């Protein structure tokens, strides 16, 4: 009924829904269109932050290092970057948290400037065993989501497994892992997407994405009692409104819940 519930949503809302749910070791729990490529949109900002924590964990980067910038770095949806503009900088950590929890595009591009751009992001994906995810552009053009373009894409299964490697498979130190987990729980942008359709006693942390051409995504983790899962949801619904798109992802949330509770 998991498959057929998602198929009903897909049929009724003229949408495609890609889902993957994996256990802490990346073993598959459930999936739908799980190896179809979808635009990442802002979901790559979670892996970016992980890349930054790996560098902090390694010493090649320092969390409180100040990153100076000017108005040239302000792009669409840069709420923290605009607020910190007068001060002249955000630290590596401030920028990373804003990228995750506000989806701040300027903060994201500020970090890419520092780690070596899209190519460095793709190299990190490969390092942690993800041969699929690829960042090819910075924001905002990376979310162009042109039909059929494989630039800036992932698969549900690939991203879900990267989530698990980051949160459970030892990609980061215990300390950096804990920090990035809490940032996902505290995400400010996902109240109407997956976690809306999960039970309110499940610990959920996630990162949303919105792309042009009807892309709406949410990736992260959930803890249903003593059971940890990594989850990635990418959806394409060109004809839905934005609120309908939020509510589509929430519904996927519910279908996911109906399965786990079985």
Residue ranges of the domains in the chain?
A: 2-261
Q: Write phi, then psi, for 162 (nearest 5 degrees).
A: -70, -40
Resolution in Å, one decimal place: 1.7
Using CA atoms, how far residue 225 sits from 91, 99, 171, in Å, is 36, 29, 24
Rounded distance between C-alpha atoms, residue 156 and residue 136, angstroms: 18
Rounded distance between C-alpha atoms, residue 5 and residue 61, angstroms: 45
Q: Is 241:220 a contact under the CB 8 Å cutoff? A: no
Yes or no: domain 2-261 corresponds to CATH 3.40.1190.20: no
CA 43 to chain centre: 3
Bridge partners (DSSP) of residue 231 are: 21, 220
| PDB experimental method | X-ray
Q: Is 18:38 a contact under the CB 8 Å cutoff? A: yes
CA 56 to chain centre: 20
Is the dihedral angle over the CA atoms 194, 195, 201, 204 positive or is it negative?
positive
Laid out side by side, the sheet with 16-22 consists of: 28-32, 16-22, 227-236, 215-224, 203-211
Please state the residue numbers annotated as binding site for a beta-lactam.
45, 103, 139, 210
**Around 36, how many Cα atoms within 13 Å sit in the side-chain half-sphere?**
14
- Residue 42 is among the residues annotated as catalytic for this protein: yes
Please state the residue numbers annotated as binding site.
45, 103, 139, 210
Catalytic pick from 42, 78, 176, 251? 42
CA 126 to chain centre: 17
């Amino acid at each position: 009924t998991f498959k057929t519930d998602l198929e009903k949503l897909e049929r009724e809302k003229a949408a495609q829904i890609g889902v993957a749910i994996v256990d802490p070791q990346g073993e598959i729990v459930a999936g739908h269109r799980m190896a179809q490529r979808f635009a990442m949109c802002s979901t790559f900002k979670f892996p970016l932050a992980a890349l930054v924590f790996e560098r902090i964990d390694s010493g090649t980067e320092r969390g409180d290092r100040k990153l100076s910038y000017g108005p040239d770095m302000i792009v669409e949806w840069s709420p923290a970057t605009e607020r910190f503009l007068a001060s002249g900088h955000m630290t590596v950590l401030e920028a990373a948290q804003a990228a995750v929890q506000l989806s701040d595009n300027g903060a994201t591009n500020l970090l890419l400037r520092e780690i070596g751009g899209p190519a460095a992001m793709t190299q990190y994906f490969r390092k942690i065993g993800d041969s699929v995810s690829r960042l090819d552009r910075k924001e905002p053009e990376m979310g162009d989501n042109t039909p059929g373009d494989l630039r800036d894409t992932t698969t549900p299964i690939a991203m879900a497994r990267t989530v698990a490697k980051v949160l459970y498979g030892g990609a980061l130190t215990s300390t950096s892992t804990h920090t990035i987990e809490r940032w996902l729980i505290g995400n400010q942008t996902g109240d109407a997407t997956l976690r809306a359709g999960f039970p309110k006693d499940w610990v959920v942390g996630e990162k949303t994405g919105t792309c042009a051409n009807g892309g709406r995504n949410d990736i992260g983790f959930f803890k249903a009692q003593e059971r940890d899962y990594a989850v990635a949801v990418y959806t394409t619904a060109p004809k839905l409104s934005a609120v309908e798109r939020d509510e589509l992802v929430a519904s996927v949330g519910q279908v996911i819940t109906q399965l786990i509770l079985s």
